[PDB]
């Protein structure tokens, strides 16, 4: 008999430890092992062990924890993860809680009412082993939640009744073994979305009546009590936010038609004057966020207030109702009283319990802090995209669970699948604000840093995971205008390890350096905020790549050229995206990059800069010779001549785009003149026209991985933005030597066109 | 490898056929009597289709020889139940299974 | 970077030798390191000279000295008391961390490993005695235990030590089967797995299988289960591969650990009737009775309804018939002192044997059973419905 | 968008007053150890726990603000002074001075919200000429000979904030054409003026009364192995902010028109320089020959020459 282990100290301890092992082998979201453990112990033996009054106590706690871990912990953790995200639909059920009863001498009970909020769908697969090739066995084992609910309610009643009389043999031994597992099971049950209003009333009928908070309970019991009260207040804050959104729907519905009516009235009774065009510009410009900021300010005597004063009364009434529902001027009073009483009774150990108690007391006395911290995270969507948002939330929860568990092959594959799902969820396109509020980029960045941790340059564990993460981040930064700013902070980190993923022309997208370039690209504000704690780091990386041989091509079989042109191209491309935005050259960024590049001369090509190679002409001719002679390559592959040509073209393009300006400010500024003189001393003009005049062959198709006209296009851009064409002599010379053969080769085309 | 030992007759007149989702009540156990699976524990029956390749062969080819309301003991063989690899975690390799299959309803 | 200092005649005005007083704690710690490494090198030289071949016994083998040194070093690395002032406990923790770092950065863990290897080259205390002597053969066990305790204490609290020496886990788990220092090796493994997450990345399936074999050989020890829990979850994160390996190699056959079941309570009823045989006065050695059933559910709550009938013997001519103790799953026929029948099988010694009969079935409702018993030549017998 | 605006400018506009009553009914010994004393001991143990980086500790960041906001024609002035002293006694007899010292020492000289909150708490606990808390802090720093607190103060003073012109020029260039956000967050030019003034006001309150012992301890930490001159760090930061203001004047030298952003940056720089000057005055006040010689044998003269120049020209 299992109850006979009360006297046997060896078997009792061994079974307690084997229950702890059963719990720990499937504690996290590992369901393949729980699907075996359920039958390894039993289905109903868990109920019998949690119900039996005669238990050693160690076995009781073990069986309680085992039940929690193998039947409820997965969905409990999912709810705890997606508990601070207040995603609301726009259905008519949301507009049913606009009253949030606080008036007429009532406050209501926490957890009673309507949820109408986006929550993860719960489901538990049926444990069956005769069924060969089960579908996924991924959700959880099935358990009789209603029977467990009734059992735990009646057992909690019996337990509080027994503890009220202070018996000399509580269930399982000490009052700790009596209460802690039972209240933990009740807490996780209340968390996992059961105990509807009818049962929650009876549950409150043993802690509320003015009970369980009045007894002399030990520390691990009052800790679970504090967690329970914290959840009881979290659901109250959630109800507050739901009511806020419910009222806000109708309020903005009225305000939008009011402002449209006032705009139509202005359009009708225009009465053309000087201020009419100013009001028109104010209506056209001042995007909706600034418009809302202007139309919502009336707390003082008089300020910028629009015509609809009638809705101001409704807004003030709703705000007063909100403030009197909050902690400012009975659940909060009871919680604060219990906390101060527990603190005054005796000196309390367990600093975790002390911290929980004090944060609960602080949030009860504050009240508005929860709102000001949770309203930035709340978001209302629609009554049509509820299923898409549910799928998105499920995928995000799966990604978070994989982030919690360790990284492996299966975990990497599941994370890649989840990234694909959240990219194709069709809501990422529509609501980027919701993505930024959920913090998907933060979780993906944490996954990326966890993958990159362990090795700097020796080996990157779990490849292609950082790739999928970087691609997701690139797309997230691309479809936005402020998420680029939200990601700009992580740029300072990812620029440190941006060396990974390079030297491999298979991922022109996913790369940390490429996601940096995507965050900086097409944003003048971000390009200006990009100061120089990291431009010098990028220049140091460029110098290292131009000095060393990257130690990656010698293993593939390349002839080990004394410089790396595959990483230099990427570094120069990032510098170009950072220095040239929206068609204009950022002055300070261009100046500082020119300073760094002239202070470190090895960033340029060895055949162009230095006491060795003559210049860009001979450099590119040697590159073409190497591209033509296959004896200097690696036996999809990296053409070394094409790589050198693209590196030099990217360097020339970067210099041309970091040129001061189109002479607008250069006609009056001396620093621009000095920068232009430095660029001219770096790159001569005869060099430029000689490299322009190559007369590339025009083909029976050929390969586009050789000398492409993009190089000469970059050369023309540099000549236009640095030297320019102003004298008839040089204009005609360039037209005769470089432009005429290329124009003739482009005109010599009838049907076979493969090089656009 | 599949057999059947009648524990309680089930009138021997109504038999399952291909294309039906039969309702079953079984309690499995290993060769040494150690129970590894059951259906009366979770208080719910087991609805499975015959000839759809969803349950093990030792179960379906043994249930196809029973009657409505009949109780039988179905013995298996590793090569007909799980093979030389077994079920990872619960069933050991080369394990002879024994099921107390009670037929509930025919659909 | 190694700028080798050279004493030259000229010298330059850029030396600038500033001083740092080398706090007494660190100074004493370093002197202890020096004394311990000297004594351990002496012991290693002696043990190697004894092990490579037979040699003269006029060597330095300070058995009691190294025993006392280990007993002092264990107390030196002893953790502070939990029932102490908080600030003093934190100061003692910082001092212990500093001592562990200074011992690690001077190559002491590898020295302890070499000593453990040179002590493990011998098989038993009797095998070591005839090579080293009576006192050494008697104290070899204590020296090995103290060495393993010191190795565990050197890495109990620190994290860098485990993250550095974790490469020796293969040697640790291979020596785990020495049948002598299993407790010490298991404690070292647990304390290196509970802190360093890098150690869990080098634990392959072979190591887990060897740990489970240790659990299968040395018996039921909760330290093995704690090590397995640490392997499953290190720091708030799970290792799916290790969890699957544990679930696959620990409970496939259910013989490694205890099992549980939920059985029914059975009771044994009987009339006040006793049947015994002897020479002389007998009771005709022939009896018979009948049996009917009114209502019997096949499954009351969760399992098969236990229902057997038969004849049970006693302990000679005394009450309290066969059975394990009471109240168990032992009805009739579940032991050698009882013989029962349930409708389809025969129970004698908790081993059911199947039988053949027209319309064979369990003891369902409206079933007429008849039990007869001849005592001398034949045995009991049953007839169902005639 | 309406909900975002409501969260931004409708709720957090000072709609509650509960710090005083909270501190009161937390210090009330309902009956041992008071709840406030237990909380202070918890924070002290957390700050004394050996770590490598000071954690965020939202609990501490939320309770230090409460304990700091709880604090704060002759008879009414004396009575309000007595009430301030009573509140400081109530929330410092439980070891809050030691808590602030430990929280400052357990930051390694890293500017953060924890350090900002603990500096605000130190200010609210040393407001006025409170000598009891100063003596408690000095006795603690003498009984626990630690250089961590002093080197953390030195690092904070060395890397708190300095006015820069490049960020201001970039902000002007951005606001010249970009109207997408108008850059309402006027930052990155003077990072944490609030934190800098709070640190220097904490130092000023540490040297508020003419404590010769504390004024000499802030210069030469006798009894410790290594000493750092807080006076020299302060005069170096004064020189830095003087150079910054001089460069800002050289920028705004010629146009004779000061926009709102320039006016706000100038006001912040003036406030920071005024707080630094007040800290120096509290350092040198009284016949403190040591600090007088320390300030006379430094670059304070170059700093004050530059200050006189910018004063004349800007006025």
D164 C-beta neighbours (distance < 10 Å), count: 17
State the resolution, in angstroms: 3.5
Q: What is the rounded distance in angstroms from the CA atom of residue C335 to the CA atom of residue A428?
A: 70
Max Cα distance, chain D (Å) = 70
User: Residue C88 contacts by C-beta under 8 Å, 6 or more apart in sequence?
Assistant: C80
Our answer to whether residue B100 is catalytic in this structure is no
In chain B, whose CA is at the least distance from the CA of A132? B55
Residues D67, D39 contacting (CB under 8 angstroms) = no
Rg (CA), chain D: 22
Distance of CA A259 to the CA centre of its chain: 36
Residues A154, A199 contacting (CB under 8 angstroms) = no
Residues facing B6 on adjacent strands:
B72
Residues A39, A32 contacting (CB under 8 angstroms) = no
A744 C-beta neighbours (distance < 10 Å), count: 11
Residues A347, D38 contacting (CB under 8 angstroms) = yes
Residues D36, D27 contacting (CB under 8 angstroms) = yes
**A48 close contact with B: CB closer than 8 A:** no
Please enumerate, as own/partner, the contacts of A329-334 that have beta carbons within 8 Å and a separation of 24 or more: A330/A107, A331/A107, A331/A110, A331/A232, A331/A233, A331/A236, A332/A233, A332/A364, A332/A365, A332/A367, A334/A208, A334/A210, A334/A213
**In the structure encoding, which two tokens stand for residue D287, read together?**
């016949």
Residue of B105, B107, B106, B101 whose CA lies nearest to B39: B101
> For an interface test with B, which of A36, A130, A135, A148 has the most B Cβ atoms less than 10 Å from its Cβ?
A130
- Residues in A lying within 8 Å of C, measured between beta carbons: 1-2, 10-11, 13-18, 20-21, 24-30, 32-33, 36-37, 40-42, 44-45, 48, 404-406, 408, 410-411
H-state helical runs in A71-206: 73-81, 145-164, 175-191, 197-204
User: For the purposes of burial, counting CB atoms within 10 Å of the CB of B32, is it exposed (0-12), middle (13-18) or buried (19 or more)?
Assistant: exposed
User: Strand pairing of A379-380 and A87-88?
Assistant: parallel
Question: Which subunits have 3 or more CB–CB pairs within 8 Å of chain B?
Answer: A, C
Among partner residues C220, C240, C262, which is closest to A48 by beta-carbon distance? Answer: C262
User: Residue D263 contacts by C-beta under 8 Å, 6 or more apart in sequence?
Assistant: none
C15 C-beta neighbours (distance < 10 Å), count: 8
Our answer to whether residue B91 is catalytic in this structure is no
Residues C70, C150 contacting (CB under 8 angstroms) = yes
Q: Minimal Cα–Cα distance from A515 to chain D, Å?
A: 23
Residue of A489, A442, A448, A484 whose CA lies nearest to A467: A448
Residues facing C382 on adjacent strands:
C371
Residues facing C371 on adjacent strands:
C289, C382
Among partner residues C252, C344, C359, which is closest to B89 by beta-carbon distance? Answer: C252
HEC profile of C157-201:
CCCHHHHHHHHHHHHHHHHCCCCCCHHHHHHHHHHHHCCCCCHHH
The vertex-A584 CA angle with A583 and A590, nearest 5°, equals 130
Residue of D139, D158, D156, D66 whose CA lies nearest to D103: D156
Residue of D159, D180, D160, D163 whose CA lies nearest to D261: D163
Active-site residue identified among B59, B82, B98, B100? B82
A436 C-beta neighbours (distance < 10 Å), count: 18
Q: What is the rounded distance in angstroms from the CA atom of residue D23 to the CA atom of residue D125?
A: 14
Our answer to whether residue B37 is catalytic in this structure is yes
End-to-end CA distance of chain C: 103
Q: What is the rounded distance in angstroms from the CA atom of residue A136 to the CA atom of residue A125?
A: 9
Q: What is the rounded distance in angstroms from the CA atom of residue D247 to the CA atom of residue D163?
A: 9
A251 C-beta neighbours (distance < 10 Å), count: 17
Q: What is the rounded distance in angstroms from the CA atom of residue A314 to the CA atom of residue A517?
A: 48
DSSP string, C209-235: HHHHHHHHHH---HHHHHHHHHHHBSS
Which helix or strand (DSSP H or E) is residue A680 part of?
helix A670-682
Our answer to whether residue B41 is catalytic in this structure is no
Tell me, what DSSP letter sits at residue A122?
A: P
Residues A511, A498 contacting (CB under 8 angstroms) = yes
H-state helical runs in chain D: 2-9, 19-27, 35-48, 58-70, 75-92, 96-105, 113-126, 131-143, 148-158, 166-177, 193-206, 212-217, 230-251, 260-284, 289-296, 300-314
A704 vs A701, A754, C290, CA distance in Å? 9, 9, 101
Among partner residues B8, B34, B40, which is closest to C254 by beta-carbon distance? Answer: B34
- Residues in D lying within 8 Å of C, measured between beta carbons: 45, 48-50, 225
Active-site residue identified among B91, B98, B99, B100? B99
C269 vs C305, C307, C312, C332, D135, CA distance in Å? 16, 12, 11, 10, 88
Rg (CA), chain A: 35
Sign, CA dihedral A638-A644-A649-A651, equals: positive
The number of CA neighbours under 13 Å toward the Cβ of A9 is: 0
User: φ, ψ for residue A313 (rounded to 5)?
Assistant: -65, -45
Q: Is A661 helix (H, G, I), strand (E, B) or coil?
A: coil
C321-342: buried (b, 16+ CB within 10 Å) or exposed (e) per residue? ebbeeeeeebbbbbbebbbbbb
User: For the purposes of burial, counting CB atoms within 10 Å of the CB of A643, is it exposed (0-12), middle (13-18) or buried (19 or more)?
Assistant: buried
DSSP string, A545-599: HHHS-TTTHHHHT----SS-HHHHHHHHHHHHHHHEETTEE-HHHHHHHHHHHHH
Q: What is the rounded distance in angstroms from the CA atom of residue A437 to the CA atom of residue A423?
A: 16
Q: What is the rounded distance in angstroms from the CA atom of residue A629 to the CA atom of residue A488?
A: 44
User: For the purposes of burial, counting CB atoms within 10 Å of the CB of D226, is it exposed (0-12), middle (13-18) or buried (19 or more)?
Assistant: exposed
- Residues in C lying within 8 Å of B, measured between beta carbons: 244, 247-248, 251-254, 259, 261, 298-299, 302-304, 344, 354, 359-362, 364
Which helix or strand (DSSP H or E) is residue B49 part of?
strand B46-49
D179 vs A279, A677, B15, CA distance in Å? 17, 34, 80
Q: What is the rounded distance in angstroms from the CA atom of residue A118 to the CA atom of residue A85?
A: 9
Q: Is D167 helix (H, G, I), strand (E, B) or coil?
A: helix
The vertex-C299 CA angle with C298 and C300, nearest 5°, equals 115
Q: What is the rounded distance in angstroms from the CA atom of residue A6 to the CA atom of residue A169?
A: 13
C16 C-beta neighbours (distance < 10 Å), count: 5
Tell me the residues of chain A between 133 and 152 that have a Cβ less than 8 Å away from chain B.
133, 142, 144
User: Residue A124 contacts by C-beta under 8 Å, 6 or more apart in sequence?
Assistant: A71, A139, A140, A141, A142, A143
Q: Determination method here?
A: cryo-EM
Residues D266, D251 contacting (CB under 8 angstroms) = no
**In the structure encoding, which two tokens stand for residue D132, read together?**
């009891």
Q: What is the rounded distance in angstroms from the CA atom of residue C286 to the CA atom of residue C375?
A: 6
Q: What is the rounded distance in angstroms from the CA atom of residue C205 to the CA atom of residue C189?
A: 16
A208-245: buried (b, 16+ CB within 10 Å) or exposed (e) per residue? beeebbeeebeebbbbbbbbbbbbbbbbbbbbbbbbbb
**A129 with B48: Cβ contact below 8 A:** no
Residue of A709, A705, A683 whose CA lies nearest to A694: A709
User: Residue D4 contacts by C-beta under 8 Å, 6 or more apart in sequence?
Assistant: A289, A292, A375, A376
User: For the purposes of burial, counting CB atoms within 10 Å of the CB of A581, is it exposed (0-12), middle (13-18) or buried (19 or more)?
Assistant: buried
CA dihedral B19, B21, B22, B23 (to 10 degrees): 180
In chain C, whose CA is at the least distance from the CA of B42? C302
End-to-end CA distance of chain B: 27
C115-133: buried (b, 16+ CB within 10 Å) or exposed (e) per residue? bbebbeebeeeeebbeebe
Distance of CA C239 to the CA centre of its chain: 22
């Amino acid at each position: 008999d299992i109850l006979e282990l009360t006297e046997q100290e060896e078997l009792l301890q061994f079974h307690y430890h084997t229950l702890r092992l059963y719990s720990a082998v499937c504690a996290l979201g590992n369901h393949r092992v729980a699907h075996a453990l359920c039958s390894h112990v039993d289905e109903p033996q868990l109920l019998y062990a949690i119900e039996n009054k005669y238990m050693p106590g160690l076995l009781r706690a073990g069986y309680y924890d085992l039940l929690i871990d193998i039947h409820l912990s997965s969905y409990a953790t999912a709810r705890l993860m997606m508990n601070n995200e207040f995603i609301v639909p726009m259905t008519e059920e949301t507009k049913s809680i606009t009253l949030f009863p606080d008036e007429n001498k009532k406050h209501g009970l926490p957890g009673i009412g309507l949820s109408t909020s986006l929550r993860p769908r719960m489901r538990f697969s049926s444990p069956s082993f005769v069924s060969i090739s089960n579908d996924c066995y991924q959700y959880s084992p099935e358990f009789p939640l209603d029977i467990l609910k009734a059992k735990t309610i009646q057992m909690l009643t019996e337990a509080v009744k027994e503890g009220s009389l202070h018996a000399r043999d509580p269930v399982g031994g000490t009052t700790e073994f009596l209460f802690v597992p039972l209240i933990k099971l009740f807490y996780t049950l209340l968390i996992m979305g059961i105990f509807h209003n009818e049962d929650l009333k009876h549950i409150l009928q043993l802690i509320e009546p003015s009970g369980l908070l009045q007894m002399k309970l030990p520390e691990p019991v009052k800790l679970q009590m504090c967690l329970l009260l914290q959840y009881l207040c979290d659901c109250q804050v959630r109800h507050r936010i739901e009511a806020i959104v419910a009222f806000s729907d109708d309020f903005v519905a009225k305000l939008q038609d009011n402002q449209r009516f006032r705009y139509n009235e202005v359009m009708q009774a225009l009465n053309m004057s000087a201020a009419l065009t100013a009001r028109k510009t104010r209506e056209f410009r001042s995007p909706p966020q600034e418009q809302i900021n202007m139309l919502l300010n009336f707390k003082d005597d008089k300020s910028e207030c629009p015509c609809p004063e009638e809705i101001r009364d409704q807004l003030l009434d709703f705000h007063e109702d909100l403030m009197t529902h909050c902690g400012i001027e009975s659940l909060q009073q009871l919680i604060s009283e219990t906390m101060v009483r527990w603190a005054q009774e005796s000196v309390i150990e367990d600093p975790e319990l002390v911290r929980a108690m004090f944060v609960l007391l602080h949030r009860q006395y504050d009240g508005i802090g929860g709102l000001v911290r949770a309203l930035p995270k709340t978001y209302t969507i629609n009554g049509v995209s509820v299923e898409d948002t549910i799928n998105l939330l499920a995928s995000l929860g799966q990604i978070r669970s994989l982030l919690s568990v360790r990284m492996g092959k299966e975990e990497e594959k599941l994370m890649i699948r989840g990234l694909g799902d959240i990219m194709n969820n069709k809501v990422f396109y529509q609501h980027p604000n919701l993505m930024r509020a959920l913090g998907m980029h933060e979780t993906v960045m944490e996954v990326m840093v966890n993958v990159l941790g362990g090795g700097e340059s020796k080996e990157i564990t779990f490849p292609k995971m950082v790739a999928n993460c970087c691609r997701f981040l690139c797309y997230f930064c691309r479809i936005s205008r402020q998420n680029q700013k939200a990601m700009f902070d992580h740029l300072s980190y990812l620029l440190e390890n941006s060396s990974v993923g390079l030297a491999s022309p298979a991922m022109r997208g996913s790369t940390p350096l490429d996601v940096a370039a995507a965050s900086v690209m097409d944003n003048n504000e971000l390009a200006l905020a990009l100061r120089e704690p990291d431009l010098e780091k990028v220049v140091r990386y460029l110098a290292g790549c131009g000095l060393q041989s990257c130690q990656m091509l010698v293993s593939k079989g390349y002839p080990d050229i004394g410089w790396n042109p595959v990483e230099g191209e990427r570094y120069l491309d990032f510098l170009r995206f950072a220095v040239f935005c929206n068609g204009e050259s950022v002055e300070e960024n261009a100046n500082v990059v020119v300073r760094l590049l002239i202070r470190r001369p090895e960033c340029f090509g060895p055949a162009l800069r230095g006491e060795g190679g003559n210049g860009l002409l001979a450099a590119m001719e040697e590159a073409i010779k190497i591209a033509e002679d296959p004896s200097r390559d690696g036996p999809d592959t990296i053409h070394m001549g094409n790589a050198i040509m693209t590196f030099y073209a990217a360097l020339i393009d970067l210099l041309g785009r970091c040129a001061p300006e189109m002479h607008l400010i250069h006609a009056g500024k001396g620093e621009a003149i000095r920068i232009r003189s430095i660029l001219r001393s770096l790159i001569p003009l005869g060099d430029l026209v000689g490299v322009i005049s190559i007369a590339f062959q025009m083909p029976e198709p050929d390969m586009s991985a050789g000398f492409c006209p993009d190089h000469k296009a970059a050369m023309v851009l540099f000549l236009d933005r640095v030297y320019g064409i102003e004298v008839q002599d040089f204009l005609l010379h360039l037209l005769e030597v470089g432009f005429l053969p290329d124009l003739r080769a482009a005109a010599s085309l009838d049907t076979a066109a493969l090089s656009x | 490898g599949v057999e059947i030992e009648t524990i309680s007759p089930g009138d021997g007149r109504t038999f399952p056929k291909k294309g039906q989702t039969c309702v079953v009540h079984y309690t499995g156990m290993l060769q040494n009597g150690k129970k590894f699976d059951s259906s009366r524990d979770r208080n719910k029956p087991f609805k499975f289709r015959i000839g759809k390749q969803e349950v093990i062969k030792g179960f379906e080819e043994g249930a196809a020889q029973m009657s409505l309301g009949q109780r039988a003991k179905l013995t298996c063989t590793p090569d007909v139940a799980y093979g030389a690899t077994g079920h990872p975690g619960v069933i050991p390799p080369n394990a002879t299974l024994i099921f107390d299959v009670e037929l509930l309803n025919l659909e | 970077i190694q700028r080798k200092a050279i004493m030259h005649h000229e010298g330059h005005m850029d030396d600038g030798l500033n001083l740092s007083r080398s706090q007494h704690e660190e100074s004493r710690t370093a002197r202890v390191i020096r004394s311990t490494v000297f004594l351990f090198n002496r012991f290693i030289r002696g043990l190697d000279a004894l092990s490579k071949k037979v040699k003269l016994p006029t060597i330095d083998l300070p058995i009691e000295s190294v025993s006392l040194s280990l007993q002092d070093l264990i107390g030196y690395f002893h953790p502070p008391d939990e029932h102490l002032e908080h600030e003093d406990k934190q100061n003692r923790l910082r001092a212990l961390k500093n001592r562990q770092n200074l011992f690690q950065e001077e190559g002491m863990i590898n020295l302890v490993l070499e000593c453990i290897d040179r002590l493990h080259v011998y098989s038993s205390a009797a095998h070591f005695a005839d090579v080293a002597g009576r006192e050494a053969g008697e104290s070899w066990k204590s020296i090995l235990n103290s060495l393993y305790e010191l190795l565990a204490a050197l890495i109990r609290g620190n994290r860098k030590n485990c993250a550095q020496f974790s490469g020796s886990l293969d040697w640790l788990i291979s020596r785990l089967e020495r049948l002598e220092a299993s407790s010490g090796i298991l404690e070292v493994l647990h304390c290196v797995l509970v802190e360093s997450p890098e150690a869990l990345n080098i634990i392959k399936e072979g190591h887990i299988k060897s740990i489970i074999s240790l659990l299968d050989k040395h018996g039921r020890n909760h330290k093995v289960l704690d090590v397995l829990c640490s392997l499953c979850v290190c720091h708030g994160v799970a290792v799916r591969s290790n969890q699957h390996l544990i679930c696959d190699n620990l409970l496939p056959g259910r013989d490694l650990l205890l099992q549980t079941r939920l059985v029914n309570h059975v009771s044994s009823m009987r009339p006040n009737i006793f049947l015994g045989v002897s020479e002389g006065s007998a009771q005709y050695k022939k009896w018979y009775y009948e049996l009917m059933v009114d209502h019997t559910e096949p499954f009351v709550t969760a399992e098969a309804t236990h229902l057997r009938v038969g004849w049970a013997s006693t302990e000679g001519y005394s009450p309290y018939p066969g059975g394990g103790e009471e109240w168990g799953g032992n009805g009739v026929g579940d032991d050698l002192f009882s013989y029962g029948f349930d409708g389809l099988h025969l129970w004698s010694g908790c081993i059911a044997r199947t039988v053949s009969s027209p319309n064979q079935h369990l003891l369902r409702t409206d079933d007429v059973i008849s039990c007869c018993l001849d005592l001398s030549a034949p045995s009991i017998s049953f007839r169902i419905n005639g | 968008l309406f909900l975002q605006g409501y969260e931004k400018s409708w709720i957090e506009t000072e709609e509650h007053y509960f710090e005083d009553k909270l501190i009161e009914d937390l210090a009330k010994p309902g009956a041992r150890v008071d709840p406030l004393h237990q909380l202070i001991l918890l924070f002290s143990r957390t700050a004394l726990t050996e770590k490598c980086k000071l954690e965020e500790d939202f609990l501490y960041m939320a309770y230090a603000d409460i304990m700091a906001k709880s604090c704060h024609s002759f008879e009414e002035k004396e009575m309000e002074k007595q009430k301030l002293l009573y509140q400081q006694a109530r929330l410092h007899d439980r070891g809050a001075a030691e808590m602030v010292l430990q929280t400052i020492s357990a930051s390694k000289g890293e500017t953060g919200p924890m350090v900002a909150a603990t500096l605000k708490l130190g200010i609210a606990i040393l407001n006025g000429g409170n000598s009891t808390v100063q003596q408690k802090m000095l006795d603690y720093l003498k009984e626990k000979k630690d250089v961590g607190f002093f080197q953390s103060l030195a690092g904070l003073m060395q890397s708190c904030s300095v006015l820069d012109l490049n960020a201001f020029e970039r902000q002007n260039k951005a606001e010249g054409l970009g109207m997408v956000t108008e850059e309402g967050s006027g930052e990155k030019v003077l990072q944490d003026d609030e934190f800098t003034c709070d640190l220097f006001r904490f130092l000023q309150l540490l040297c508020e009364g003419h404590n010769s012992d504390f004024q000499n301890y802030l210069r030469t930490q006798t009894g410790n192995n290594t000493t750092v001159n807080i006076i020299i760090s302060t005069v170096d930061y004064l020189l830095r902010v003087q150079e910054s203001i001089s460069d800002f004047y050289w920028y705004y030298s010629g146009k004779d028109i000061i926009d709102e952003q320039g006016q706000r940056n100038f006001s912040k720089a003036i406030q920071v320089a005024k707080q630094v000057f007040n800290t120096l005055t509290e350092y040198i006040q009284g016949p403190c020959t040591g600090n007088q010689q320390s300030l006379a044998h430094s670059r304070l003269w170059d700093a004050v020459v530059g200050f006189l120049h910018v004063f004349a020209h800007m006025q």
